[PDB]
Amino acid sequence: PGDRQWYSFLASSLVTFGSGLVVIIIYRIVLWLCCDWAGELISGQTTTGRILVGLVFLLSIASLIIYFIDASTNTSSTTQQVDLAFNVFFMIYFFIRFVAANDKLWFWVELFSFVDYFTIPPSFVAIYLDRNWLGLRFLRALRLMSIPDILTYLNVL
Numbered sequence: 001p002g003d004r005q006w007y008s009f010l011a012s013s014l015v016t017f018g019s020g021l022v023v024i025i026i027y028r029i030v031l032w033l034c035c036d037w038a039g040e041l042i043s044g045q046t047t048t049g050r051i052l053v054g055l056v057f058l059l060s061i062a063s064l065i066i067y068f069i070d071a072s073t074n075t076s077s078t079t080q081q082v083d084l085a086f087n088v089f090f091m092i093y094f095f096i097r098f099v100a101a102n103d104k105l106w107f108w109v110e111l112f113s114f115v116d117y118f119t120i121p122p123s124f125v126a127i128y129l130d131r132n133w134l135g136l137r138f139l140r141a142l143r144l145m146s147i148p149d150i151l152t153y154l155n156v157l
Contacts, residue, residue, distance in 0.1 A: 009133045012121030020108040020117070027104055038100035050153045053146055056093060059086045060143035063119075067137045074132060083137075084127060087120050115139045 001007070043049035063086055066079045094116050101107035122135030151157050 008129065009122050009125045009131075009135055012125045013118050013136070016121050017114075017117050020113070024104060024108045036100050038096050039102075042097055042100060044149070045153050045155075050150075052093070053153070054150055056090070057143060057146050057150060059089060060140045062086060063137060063140045064144075067134065067140075070132070071134060074134070076127075076130075080127065083123060087123050090116060091120055111142070115142055 003011075040046065041048055041052060063083060066083055069079065094113075097112075098107065107113065118136035118139050122133065123137070126133045126135060148157070
């Protein structure tokens with residue numbers, strides 16, 4: 001079956017998504033069957049939100065660039081540690097938006113949730129297993145969708 005080649009890396013992402021689905025199902029059951037400052041942190045033109053979104057966007061650019069470099073040179077490293085630090089920042093930001101989620105019914109299933117699901121656990125598995133699996137880090141390029149809003153936050157267009 002070749003589970004180590006492809007299934008091993010995607011297994012972490014699948015298990016994380018399944019755990020999120022279990023959590024959301026438990027939350028729905030509790031809400032139905034059973035008995036912010038962070039919101040300001042991801043605001044728009046505000047300085048804190050502007051800085052946070054710009055940092056996330058530039059880190060996404062750097063992650064895409066290093067992924068392209070790895071793909072070009074494809075047949076530990078300093079770029080691996082840089083990617084690990086950027087993923088740590090990304091997961092901290094993900095938890096920050098988690099504690100600011102107005103409704104968890106659509107937070108765990110949101111597009112950026114899928115992006116981090118297919119980005120970070122694959123990075124963990126690649127680091128632990130010491131393999132050149134690219135994973136789905138290219139999905140970080142989806143974060144480039146924040147380009148116009150940042151400009152709208154910088155008031156250039």
